[PDB]
Each structure stands twice: as structure tokens, then as C-alpha cells.
């Protein structure tokens, strides 16, 4: 691996500098919540629940209280950890609810329909981080996003967009989200303020009762019933059930650097460990970026993954995953060797890698 | 989906990726709460074969069951060097994350970009299936030519992704780059 670089004056792009704290993330209000945390003496954890809380008002495309994800934490004493917030599908969920009467997989009902929704975990997410490593209570990150959602914020650029573009397909689709993201018929616009009265309630509720109030008070209660009354599979029983889990990140060695990432539910660790293995056997500096061999490689390369990825990989806790394997360094060489600098194989002649002489 | 990163003065670092799925999910509030309802059991297999929204397919592995949860390919990350975190990253973009995060740590540690750069970079992807080579504008005609020549099924198509990256100098000086596929979003520290 040749040196590394972290900027200079003559570069044509420039990275934000800082000497205590930082954040990335894609809402400018969100970041200044995070930085505003850290500045008052708050650790990474503490400043990363509070902008995923202030996200889940001024990002509603995707920042949540109604959805899930991952978190990877590094301590500054190198202690790596992964926690898994993903939802969990219902108890009364069957593996064939999303096929129509013919046996065909039905879109609409697992992208707009209530069945398409899973158990939510962002709170317990959040809270199960928080408390094992952050150091405020839950109610000091929550406030930056209970005041956003009680006192409102200006609708940008990013938002009126996304609105007005993707919201415009579910949103006036139902009477309580039109009521919160429409007005005057149409989506919100830039310049708008937009005020989320009951987002500020259940943030307040939570903040003061501890995540136990999305997964068994009242907001659980508010869960089951939009399901209930709608044809939806949550109920509280779900919710009550549900749990965020600490699990061990997937890690690799690429060139002397050691890389953490996700570990099942999430398929993103080991693939990229397992590219990065295929990878290190070729030498990418020299080819360089943008050079049609480097892309050539690396598109082979991620070829074998997703053939993979198809058959191996799946929630731990039901399904043994072949880890190992595909993050051995003798698999992945063979992958190598199958890659022809001058000539792509065809998606069709490539299939699930023999796992077995690896296991 | 939307990711972010963060480090703070004591050399700590969390990398959160985290989703409704789709743009709003399903676009349904729960009751009175305000809150928006994802549509994630869309991830899972509906029927062996069957790709999803993301052109994503599969099996028994991820077919879709009571108390499970469905596969995801959020990839929060974090790269060590010399014994150090010295790169938070991760991005959002379904079946796109794990190249475009592959490509942040590529260009990082194999083409010696700053964060920036490696940021601002164009990106490629290929899923097997569909079996195309996507591409974002930014990369030379010339090597397009020499791709399709190889076999590839060169697609120009929409700009992938959004990292919202930090890397960490040895002396701890902390360097941040935003992507600029998203208006709005932002790297700020003090």
C-alpha cells in the first residue's frame, strides 16, 4: 500500500478540517446537533443518538423512529463493537404473505401496504448503545429533536425535493401523513416550516419514560392499533418482544489495515471483507483510479460476492452463515484467479462458490 | 436510507446507518405518533429467485419468517491503521452500499485520496444480477471503450449514494468530507 494522503493546499477537493470533535451526516441541522453534543462534553455515542434523533425529524425519508439499522462503535481503547437495531419481522409474518393468488411476489404489498412494515428497533437501537457506552441520560439527546419537532424547522432544498418527488407516491395516501407533510394540497415547499406537534409528543414521552414507551406504552398502543384497524401484522406482543443485539463486527486485513464493518443481518461486512481479500492479491495502486483494469478487477471481483451474497447470507439467528469461508484469504485467491484482466465472465457462467475446501 | 459518522475529542468513533427502506418507507404514520412507518420486510426474499426493489434475490437464507430479521446491506465501517481508527464510513444506497463504501476504502488506502477526494471521486458497480457494469458520470470515454471491449456492460445511470465520511490523523486532527450527491448535508467539528 503507498503512503496515505489527508490533504493538501494543492488538492482540487478539500476535506473539513477539525482538531476536537466532528460529524458527517446528511442534514445540516443534524450535524450541528451532533457537533452542539460534543461540544458539551458528550462522547461519540452520546452525540451519535442525538443527531439519529434529530434525523428522525428533519430527515424523514429515512432518518426514524419507525424503522431500524446498525451501529458500529470503536472505543478509543480499540474495543469494536456492532449493534444490531434491525427489525424484526412479525410473529404472525409467513413466508409467502407477499404472493397474490397466482403465487406471484406482490410489490404493493411489501412496499405501501401496513404488511410491509417490520417491528421497529431505532429505539431500542439507540438506548441499548446509549446506555452500555454513551454517558448522557436518554432525555438530554432527545431534546435538540423534541424542540425541532415541537417548534418546527424550514423546509430546504433536500426536503421540498424529496416531498415533492417520492412523498408524492404515499404520503397523501393516508389522512394522518397528510396532515403532517402536505398543506394547502400540495407537498410542503422549500421555505415552509414544518411543525410535527405528535413527533414532539412521543419524543417527549420518550425521553421521559425510557425507550418502554415505544416498545410497551403509549406509542406501542398507537403502533398496534394503525396495524389492527388497517390490516397490518404488529402487535404489541411484537413490539414487547423486540431487541436490539450486540453481536461481533465482520473483519478483514487489506494491506496491513484492518477493516470492521457489519456481520449478519447485514451481508455489507463480509462482502467487502471478501472483495477486499480478492482484491489484495492485485496491485491497485499501480493500475490507479479510473484506469479501466482497476474497474475491470474490481467488477469481476464484486461479480463472485453478490453470487454469494444471494446464497449464503440471511439473519444469524435462523440461518448458519458461512463466514469463514468467505472471508478466507485461500477462498478468496481462487476468486483471483478466475479474473481475467482482458475479459468479463458473464453473470451466467459465475454461480455460489464450493465452500467446503474452505470450511 | 441515511448514514453518518462521528468522532469526538477522546478518540472514540460510531458509524450509524439506518433506514425506513424506501424514501418515507411506506409513507404510513402510526396513529397520532407522528412517526413514519418503514417498509423493510420489502428485503427479504418474497419468493426464491424473485428480485426486489434492489434487484437483490435469494433463498431460504432471507425468506421472510416470523421474528426474523430481514437481510440488510448497511454497511457502517471503520478502517484501522497503525493500531488506529483512521477511517469512519458508510453510505446508503441498497444493494449499492457495499461497493460504494468498497471504493471509499479503496481509494483511501490504495490511491492515496484524501477523504475529500475520495468522496468526490466518480463510482462503478457491479451486482451480478442484473448483469451490468453501472457507472456515474466522471469516468473517460476512453476507458468506458475499453470496458465494453472487455465484456462489460458499461450503464451509465444516477449518481450512487452518500457518504458522509471522517478520517483521523495519527496526531489526532480530525478530516471530514460530506458526498455531494446530497444537497444540504454537511461535516462540521470544532
Redesign the interface.
Known amino acids: 500500500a503507498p503512503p496515505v494522503s489527508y490533504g493538501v493546499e494543492e488538492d482540487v477537493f478539500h476535506p473539513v478540517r477539525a482538531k476536537q470533535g466532528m460529524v458527517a451526516s446528511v442534514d445540516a441541522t443534524a450535524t450541528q446537533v451532533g457537533v452542539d453534543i460534543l461540544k458539551e462534553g458528550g462522547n461519540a455515542v452520546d452525540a451519535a443518538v442525538a443527531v439519529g434523533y434529530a434525523l428522525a425529524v428533519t430527515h424523514p425519508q429515512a432518518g426514524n423512529l419507525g424503522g431500524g439499522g446498525f451501529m458500529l462503535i470503536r472505543s478509543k481503547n480499540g474495543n469494536t463493537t456492532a449493534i444490531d437495531f434491525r427489525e424484526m419481522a412479525p410473529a404472525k409474518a409467513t413466508r409467502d404473505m407477499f404472493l397474490d393468488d397466482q403465487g406471484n411476489p406482490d410489490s404493493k404489498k411489501s412496499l405501501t401496504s401496513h404488511l410491509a412494515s417490520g417491528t421497529p428497533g431505532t429505539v431500542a437501537g439507540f438506548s441499548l448503545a446509549l446506555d452500555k457506552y454513551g454517558t448522557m441520560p436518554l432525555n438530554k439527546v432527545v431534546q435538540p429533536a423534541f424542540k425541532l419537532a415541537r417548534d418546527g424547522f424550514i423546509v430546504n432544498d433536500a426536503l421540498a425535493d424529496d416531498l415533492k418527488t417520492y412523498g408524492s407516491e404515499v404520503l397523501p395516501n393516508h389522512e394522518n401523513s397528510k396532515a403532517i407533510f402536505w398543506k394547502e394540497g400540495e407537498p410542503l415547499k422549500k421555505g415552509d416550516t414544518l411543525v410535527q406537534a405528535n413527533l414532539a409528543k412521543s419524543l417527549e414521552m420518550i425521553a421521559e419514560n425510557g425507550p418502554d414507551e415505544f416498545y410497551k406504552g403509549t406509542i406501542a398502543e398507537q403502533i398496534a392499533q394503525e396495524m389492527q384497524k388497517n390490516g397490518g401484522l404488529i402487535t404489541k406482543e411484537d413490539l414487547a418482544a423486540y431487541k436490539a443485539v450486540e453481536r461481533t463486527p465482520i473483519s478483514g486485513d487489506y494491506r496491513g489495515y484492518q477493516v470492521y464493518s457489519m456481520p449478519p443481518p447485514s451481508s455489507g461486512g463480509i462482502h467487502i471483507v471478501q472483495i477486499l481479500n480478492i482484491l489484495e492479491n492485485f496491485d491497485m495502486k499501480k493500475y490507479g483510479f479510473g484506469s479501466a483494469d482497476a474497474m475491470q478487477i474490481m467488477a469481476e471481483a464484486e461479480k463472485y460476492a453478490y453470487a454469494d451474497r444471494s446464497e449464503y447470507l440471511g439473519d444469524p439467528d435462523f440461518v448458519k452463515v458461512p463466514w469463514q469461508a468467505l472471508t478466507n484469504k485461500a477462498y478468496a485467491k481462487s476468486i483471483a484467479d478466475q479474473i481475467d484482466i482482458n475479459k468479463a465472465k458473464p453473470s451466467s457462467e459465475i454461480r455460489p462458490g464450493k465452500l467446503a475446501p474452505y470450511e | ?42 428485503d ?1 426474499s ?2 426464491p429467485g ?1 428480485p ?2 434492489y434487484g ?26 497503525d ?1 488506529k ?2 477511517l469512519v464510513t ?1 453510505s ?1 444506497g441498497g ?1 449499492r ?3 460504494t ?2 471504493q471509499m ?13 475520495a ?4 463510482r ?8 451490468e ?1 453501472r457507472v456515474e458520470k466522471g ?2 470515454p476512453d ?1 468506458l471503450k ?2 465494453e471491449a ?3 456492460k458499461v450503464a451509465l445511470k444516477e449518481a450512487m449514494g ?1 457518504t ?4 483521523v ?1 495519527p496526531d ?8 455531494p450527491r ?9
Do not use: C
Not at chain 2, 468522496?119 to 466518480?122: E, K, V
Not at chain 2, 489526532?172 to 458526498?179: I, K, P, R, T, V
Open positions: 436510507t441515511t448514514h453518518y459518522s462521528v468522532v469526538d475529542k477522546d478518540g472514540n468513533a460510531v458509524a450509524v446507518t439506518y433506514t425506513l427502506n424506501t424514501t418515507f418507507g411506506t409513507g404510513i404514520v402510526a396513529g397520532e405518533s407522528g412517526i413514519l412507518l418503514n417498509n423493510q420486510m420489502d427479504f418474497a419468493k424473485v426486489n426493489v437483490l434475490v435469494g433463498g431460504d437464507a432471507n425468506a421472510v419468517g416470523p421474528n426474523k430479521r430481514p437481510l440488510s446491506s448497511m454497511s457502517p465501517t471503520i478502517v484501522v491503521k493500531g481508527t483512521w458508510g446508503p444493494s452500499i457495499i461497493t463504501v468498497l476504502v479503496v481509494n483511501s488506502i490504495d490511491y492515496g485520496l484524501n477523504v475529500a477526494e468522496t468526490n471521486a466518480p462503478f458497480h457491479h451486482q451480478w444480477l442484473p448483469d457494469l469516468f473517460s476507458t475499453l470496458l472487455k465484456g462489460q452518500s458522509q465520511s471522517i478520517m490523523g489526532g486532527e480530525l478530516y471530514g468530507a460530506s458526498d446530497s444537497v444540504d448535508d454537511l461535516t462540521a467539528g470544532y
